[PDB]
Amino acid sequence: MHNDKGEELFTGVVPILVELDGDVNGHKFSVRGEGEGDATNGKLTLKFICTTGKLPVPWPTLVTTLVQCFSRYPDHMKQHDFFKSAMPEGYVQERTISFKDDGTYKTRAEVKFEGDTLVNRIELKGIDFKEDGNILGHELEYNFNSHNVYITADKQKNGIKANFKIRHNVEDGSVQLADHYQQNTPIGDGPVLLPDNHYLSTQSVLSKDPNEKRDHMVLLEFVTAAGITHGMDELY
Ligand SMILES: [Cu+2]
Questions:
Q1: Which of 106, 134, 143, 149 is most deeply buried (CB count within 10 A of its CB)?
Q2: How buried is 194 (Cβ within 10 angstroms: 0-12 exposed, 13-18 middle, 19+ buried)?
C-alpha cells in the first residue's frame, strides 16, 4: 500500500508531538512541541517549550531538527514522496549539522505514528562549540530564511539522502552557515517510494507567545516539493 497509504494517512489535519533530548558541549536540555500539520496545504503550526529551563542554544539552530512527511507534494510528484510512504511505521532521520567556524550537531530522530499523532522523537549531541561563538553566545537573530532541501535516493539502500545549507542571520549583520547532511531510513520492512532528484522548498516564521513564561518558540512552517516536471504539460 506504500503507493497510497502514504497520502491517505495525511488527508486533513494531523496532530504532531515533538520530543527533543539535547546535549550540547555537556549542557543537557529537553524540548517538547505540539501542534498540527496539514500536508495537503503543506502547513505546520507548532509551539515548542524548553522543559529543562533556559535553552542553551538559540532556537533557530534547532528548527531543522524539530517532520518532512508534511510536505505538499504536487500530484505529478506523488510517487516521489518517500516520507509518507514509510508511514505509519515511520523512518529514522539522521543529520550532521556543521556550523561554519564552530561546532557540530549530530541528530537521530524517529518520525512515526503513535495512534493518530505524528511523532518526532529526537536525540541531539553537539560538540566543539565555541564558548563565545554565535551559538553558545546567543548571537543569532530570532528569525529564519527560506531554503531548498535537495533530496536524492540512496545508491543502494531503500532510503534517501539530503543536503542543504541553512543561513542563520547573525545579529551583527553577518551570516552563520549551518551545513546539513541528512539520511533517512524506513523503520519498517516493506517497500517504500524511492524518489528522483527533487527538493523541498521551505519557509518558516518564528514568533513568541506573549502569555508564555517558559523558554519557547512558536513556529509556522510551509513546505512543498518541487523540481520534477514530468507529467505537467496539461496544467499549462
Ligand atoms: Cu505498497
A1: 134
A2: middle
Q: Which helix (H) or strand (E) holds 72?
A: none
Q: How was this structure determined?
A: X-ray
As a whole number of angstroms, the distance between CA 50 and CA 35 comes to 15
* Distance from the alpha carbon of residue 88 to the mean position of ligand 1, in angstroms: 12
CB-CB contact of 72 with 203 (8 Å):
no
β 160-169/147-153 pair status: antiparallel
| Residue at 227: amino acid letter | G
Q: Of the candidates 223, 226, 225, which has an alpha carbon nearest to the alpha carbon of residue 44?
A: 223
39 alpha carbon – ligand 1 mean position (Å): 20
Residue 97 is which amino acid? Answer: I
Residue 103, phi then psi, degrees to nearest 5? -80, -170
Q: Which residues pair with 123 in a beta bridge?
A: 21, 108
169 Cα–ligand 1 center, Å:
42
Amino acid at 233: D
What type of residue sits at position 136? L
Q: CA 73, CA 86: separation in Å to the nearest integer?
A: 15
Structural domains present in the chain: 5-228 (2.40.155.10)
- In single-letter form, the type of residue at position 80 comes to H
Residues with CB under 5 A from ligand 1 (ion): 1-2
Resolution in Å, one decimal, please. 2.2
Please, what's the b/e burial string for 133-149 (b: 16 or more CB within 10 A of its CB; e: otherwise)? bbbbebbbeeebeebeb
Give the separation between CA 166 and CA 147, rounded to whole angstroms.
Answer: 7
